[PDB]
Amino acid sequence: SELFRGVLQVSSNVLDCANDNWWCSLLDLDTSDWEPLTHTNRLMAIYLSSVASKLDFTGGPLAGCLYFFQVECNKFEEGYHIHVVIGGPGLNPRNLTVCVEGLFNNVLYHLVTGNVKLKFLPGMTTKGKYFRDGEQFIENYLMKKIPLNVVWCVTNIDGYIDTCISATFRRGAC
């Protein structure tokens, strides 16, 4: 496949501006092969789930796209960062950033107080082109993370729908 990849940063300002809608959102999350999700970790898992649900039924440039979203927090990291792997017939290097930002920010809009938005940074090659190695990046890198270093993961890609939130499979992949 030829999937793009990039990252959205989540500063601590985003979580500081989380509103009642976000803190009170009730959504089922399958943590039976995961660590318990509480506090702002659960908010990020809920958010990622909501973004995926929106994407599953969106038209326009994002129609029919394959995606893999993974929210992470490293040691000493404030906030979170979201790895995005995404591709489809309507997505191209000219519209990728606006389309991904619009998708994530349209969901975030109802969850934060104020004009708080995320930005998307595409991963770029040595020659300055957008990477199209997204599926290999999932296999080589993203799937080798274990919770709660990886906080949550959502995908519609065949090879990962059954392992994306399997701590057991992820542990064996490292």
Numbering used by the authors: 1 to 174
From the paper:
The nuclease domain of NS1 (NS1_Nuc) is responsible for DNA Ori binding and nicking that is critical for B19V viral DNA replication. NS1_Nuc is of α/β fold in nature.
Totally, two NS1_Nuc structures (Form I and Form II) were solved. There is one NS1_Nuc molecule within the asymmetric unit. Except the extra Gly residue at the N-terminus and His175 and Ala176 at the C-terminus, all other residues are well ordered in the structure. The most distinctive conformation was observed for the β2-β3linker in the Form I structure. The side chain of Glu77 forms two H-bond interactions: one with the main chain of Asn74 and the other with the side chain of His81 (one of the catalytic residues). Compared to the Form II structure, Glu77 is shifted about 7.3 Å in the Form I structure. Superposition showed that the overall folding of NS1_Nuc is very similar in the two structures; the root mean square deviation (RMSD) value is 0.8 Å, based on 169 pairs of Cα atoms.
